[PDB]
Amino acid sequence: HHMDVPADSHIKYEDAIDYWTDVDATVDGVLGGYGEGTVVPTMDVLGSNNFLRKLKSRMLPQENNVKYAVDIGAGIGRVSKTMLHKHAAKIDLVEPVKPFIEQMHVELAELKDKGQIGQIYEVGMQDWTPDAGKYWLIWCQWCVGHLPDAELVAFLKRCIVGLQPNGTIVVKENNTPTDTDDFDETDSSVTRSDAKFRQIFEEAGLKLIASERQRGLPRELYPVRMYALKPMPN
Numbered sequence: 001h002h003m004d005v006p007a008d009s010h011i012k013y014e015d016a017i018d019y020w021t022d023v024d025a026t027v028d029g030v031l032g033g034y035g036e037g038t039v040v041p042t043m044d045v046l047g048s049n050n051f052l053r054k055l056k057s058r059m060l061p062q063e064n065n066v067k068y069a070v071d072i073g074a075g076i077g078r079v080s081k082t083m084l085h086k087h088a089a090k091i092d093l094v095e096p097v098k099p100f101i102e103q104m105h106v107e108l109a110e111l112k113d114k115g116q117i118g119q120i121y122e123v124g125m126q127d128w129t130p131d132a133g134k135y136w137l138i139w140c141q142w143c144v145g146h147l148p149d150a151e152l153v154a155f156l157k158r159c160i161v162g163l164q165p166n167g168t169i170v171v172k173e174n175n176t177p178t179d180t181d182d183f184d185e186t187d188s189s190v191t192r193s194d195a196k197f198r199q200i201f202e203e204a205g206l207k208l209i210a211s212e213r214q215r216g217l218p219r220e221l222y223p224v225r226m227y228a229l230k231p232m233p234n
């Protein structure tokens with residue numbers, strides 16, 4: 001109704017950046033205290049690796065391409081350092097927060113020695129456009145809540161342009177347990193329901209080819225879901 005203010009109306013990019021710029025540039029920092037002294041990094045990587053294994057038959061490169069990925073909302077590069085580098089031929093990263101970018105050069109040093117890091121785009125995803133046709137995989141994890149719904153639809157539409165033939169978008173994010181989105185004043189982001197995600201994916205012209213629950217996380221955390229998305233055919 002005219003009286004309701006949507007959860008995503010409260011998002012302010014500047015407030016998110018102010019929060020994250022003061023977060024420690026460590027696994028503990030980006031995971032909000034659920035670092036290597038907890039099960040979370042290990043479970044997260046296992047779940048993502050299992051998801052990509054399930055998806056292997058859906059991700060064969062076409063038209064002479066190689067497995068160029070991008071790590072969206074990358075933080076200090078944890079997902080690339082501990083997971084994506086095994087799957088990908090080359091990795092770009094998108095991250096707006098400068099202390100995180102600076103630490104990424106340390107975290108990713110061994111990958112840089114191989115030339116496996118292409119470009120680090122120091123930008124919010126809302127202002128980023130992939131090069132057309134570049135990516136085999138666009139991996140978005142624990143970051144799309146920083147964009148309101150309309151902006152997230154727009155971002156996903158730009159992602160489609162950035163996909164190789166048979167490229168894939170993965171979104172690995174929290175879900176609220178009910179059909180009402182939650183705004184977090186801490187990081188100026190929304191947590192969405194599964195139903196909201198499915199609406200957004202449809203509006204963006206994406207088909208859901210897999211939806212899997214991340215297992216093994218502490219019960220006090222929101223559920224986490226992995227979504228694999230392909231553009232709808234013309």
Ligand SMILES: Nc1ncnc2c1ncn2[C@@H]1O[C@H](CSCC[C@H](N)C(=O)O)[C@@H](O)[C@H]1O
Pocket residue numbers: 013016017020030031072073074075076077078079094095096097100123124125126141142143146147
């Ligand atoms: N508008 C935006 N666009 C892209 N990333 C954003 C963003 N606003 C915040 N972020 C980033 O989202 C990240 C959330 S923490 C998760 C980091 C990483 N995906 C991992 O799983 O380890 C932070 O690095 C934060 O700076």
